[PDB]
């Protein structure tokens, strides 16, 4: 709804772990739920 | 209330709020390329 969320976000590898996808246990739990 | 199995059916047979358009500002068309 605001302007600041359409400007390009930082473009570099500040945090490899933060972008990494969740572990196998969480995805198996969500798979079983669904 | 109990319903007997024999009866047939009895009755004859806005979207989600609009998301804001988050767009780059439009570039107006030049007369040359509008001729194109």
């Amino acid at each position: 709804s605001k302007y600041t969320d359409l400007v390009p976000k930082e473009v570099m590898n500040a945090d490899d772990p933060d972008l990494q996808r969740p572990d196998e246990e969480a995805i198996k739990e969500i798979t079983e739920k669904t | 209330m109990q319903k007997d199995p024999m009866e047939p059916p009895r009755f004859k047979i806005p979207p989600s709020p609009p998301a804001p358009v988050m767009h780059s500002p439009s570039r107006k068309m030049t007369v040359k390329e509008q001729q194109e």
Binding site: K2 | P15, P18, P20, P25
Partner: protein, 149 residues
């Protein structure tokens, strides 16, 4: 007499609802249903009409305009302001809505609201003419100090 006139209402409505059911598209035709109520001077009809019409397409550019124009015409101002608010909410790149909102905030006489609207716009800072517009705005009133910021 009068009964004939309500019959006139009803048959024109019936054929219009057929026309509307046929496509649900055709925005130019959507406006006509509304204006015919505007002639009939009963607005609640047109408020539901334009609500449905915004449901089909809010992306549209004439529709939000036309709605607010009917609002202005009917001299009812609080809803006109509020729904220009919602317009600028969901179409924040279209310049015209911003212009026709602040112009309105002037001629209706409420200085601060325009100020806040201008501040909100300062997020986007989308075009060159808009800034100039606000410069002229600020020189219109006693204030040159804000104009420096």
């Amino acid at each position: 007499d009068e009964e004939e006139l309500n019959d006139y209402k009803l048959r024109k409505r019936k054929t219009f609802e057929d026309n509307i059911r046929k496509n649900r598209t055709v925005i130019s035709n959507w406006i006509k249903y509304a204006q015919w109520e505007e002639s009939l001077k009963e607005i609640q009809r047109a408020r539901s009409i334009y609500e449905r019409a915004l449901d089909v397409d809010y992306r549209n550019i004439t529709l939000w305009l036309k709605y607010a124009e009917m609002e202005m015409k009917n001299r009812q101002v609080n809803h006109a302001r509020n729904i220009w608010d919602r317009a600028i909410t969901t179409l924040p790149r279209v310049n015209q809505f911003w212009y026709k909102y602040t112009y309105m905030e002037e001629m209706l006489g409420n200085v601060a609201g325009a100020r806040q609207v201008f501040e909100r716009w300062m997020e986007w800072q989308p075009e060159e003419q808009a800034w100039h517009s606000y410069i002229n705005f600020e020189l219109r009133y006693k204030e040159v100090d804000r104009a420096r910021t």
